[PDB]
Amino acid sequence: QRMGMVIGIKPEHIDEYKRLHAAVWPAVLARLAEAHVRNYSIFLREPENLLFGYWEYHGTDYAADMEAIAQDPETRRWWTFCGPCQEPLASRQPGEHWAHMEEVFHVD
Amino acid sequence: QRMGMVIGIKPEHIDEYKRLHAAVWPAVLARLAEAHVRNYSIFLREPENLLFGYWEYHGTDYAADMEAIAQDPETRRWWTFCGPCQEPLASRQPGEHWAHMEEVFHVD
What we know:
6 strands; globular; sugar binding protein; 108 residues; 34% helix; alpha+beta; five-stranded antiparallel β-sheet; L-rhamnose mutarotase (chains A, B); Dimeric_a/b-barrel (chains A, B); homodimer; racemase and epimerase activity, acting on carbohydrates and derivatives (chains A, B); Rham/fucose_mutarotase (chains A, B)
């Protein structure tokens, strides 16, 4: 089960965002493995200033495991550094930070 | 070796684009495997009207295999139907159709 998501990034914080993601806290990565997320990549487009997230989720209850991560106190701390670099899409859904995208094609 | 790429889509052709990619010609899919492209997904964002492509390339000379595909007469026919649905990024590089994105994070 694949997922693609998109969020804006403030251009003055691209280098900071990059620096953070060159060394993600190993427990945050462990919290993500624990929620069955695998093969997770983030890609940057300039000058449109967009981040595109891609990951494969091998779990059973997505909205559960996502709420699990969301109150793990150390992941919560981590997001205090990512967030101010980010610019959630004005067109996103209520409750969304990253905006979910619709898969229209796959081939193994 | 992962790749992420982005292109715009004309919103009046989203349904056509979706219809085409629900049943891609098997020879196009086969020539893509021939060029070592695997786990290839495309995602749609509305209302921003962006397509985000993701694939993993297990080859050894990317720029070669990408012009192998590019004059395979069936794949060229195929692109006669995708292209007109698409809107290449004004900010893209000369010679680009889809625009390359920079990976800034990965975890297995």
